[PDB]
Design a protein around this nucleic acid. Sequence first.
DNA 1: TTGACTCTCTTAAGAGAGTCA
DNA 2: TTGACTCTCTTAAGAGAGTCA
Lengths: 162, 162
Amino acid sequence: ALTNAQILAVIDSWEETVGQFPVITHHVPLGGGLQGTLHCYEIPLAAPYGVGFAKNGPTRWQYKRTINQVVHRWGSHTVPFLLEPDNINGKTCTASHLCHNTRCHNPLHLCWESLDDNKGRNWCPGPNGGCVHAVVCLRQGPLYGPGATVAGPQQRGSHFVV
Amino acid sequence: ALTNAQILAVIDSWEETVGQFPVITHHVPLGGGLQGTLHCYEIPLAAPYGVGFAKNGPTRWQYKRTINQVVHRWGSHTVPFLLEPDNINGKTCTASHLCHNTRCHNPLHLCWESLDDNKGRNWCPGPNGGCVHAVVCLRQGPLYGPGATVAGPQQRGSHFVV
DNA sequence: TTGACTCTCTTAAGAGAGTCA
DNA sequence: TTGACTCTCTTAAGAGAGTCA
Ligand code: NA
Ligand code: NA
Ligand SMILES: [Zn+2]
Ligand SMILES: [Zn+2]
Ligand SMILES: [Zn+2]
Ligand SMILES: [Zn+2]
């Protein structure tokens, strides 16, 4: 809600509830042939999810609180960042999973960045494989690698140059 | 169905027409602080576009040929790949701009791969900066770099560990 | 047969809001 | 007030198909 105090109270109640989500250990590629360990705080697969939480899509949730007799609602991963600018360079800020685990709500696994920055982490080589993200990745992106390209650049005639 | 010879004739007429598009020289980052040059064959901004070409969206075009009284139509960048498999690993193949220039129809700037592989090239460090794509990138991706993250991982209390 | 328009859809990273009990 | 559902939208890499002359 409007006040900084009200917003801090929302963040604090969100952290307390998510802090009681099951903690699931995930071993992850870091790049450079190295492996690390992340501890994700995972929202349940089915109701009930936790005080204030409800599922609006297969892997989408919202957090809601009643403040001054009014319901306030947010995307479930956006709550840590309610005191931050909601845009950057004219692009909407989004909650970005450094752990690439949508059910996870650990704020130590989230950052707040453009949708392009968010998406791009899927292909990052990782913190031990050459990540250049200023807010560093926690793991190699799940889609990093050589790809599976079916056909490369080609021409039948002689009209084109690279 | 169109014979392989009929499809090759379609590819040949497409190449003939695209080869007459304006050829624009672009200097581009290759990664590793190096600069290279790409020559893009750019479809016009407004009609007429070229024989067989029409615009179906702000940056979407189609190629149309009528063979034995049947109208055939393809996405304008898919024509080089009409003799290739159209899926891989259960994923639809898509035309992927190695030059990251949507109006370009140079077939030496296109490859044929899943939408995930396609998107991921936006963040590649490039052929002189560590590209691991088996079909190698022609340039550093336009979105490669440190990013512009507004807020990083953080908690107010002590409920979480990474 | 062809050109120049029209419309909606896919994907996978993300969102907002309404209906009931 | 709180819970458990329902619906559609955004973005930027990509698509298929209809109408008219
Ligand atoms: Na993400
Ligand atoms: Na692309
Ligand atoms: Zn996590
Ligand atoms: Zn990274
Ligand atoms: Zn090009
Ligand atoms: Zn690459």
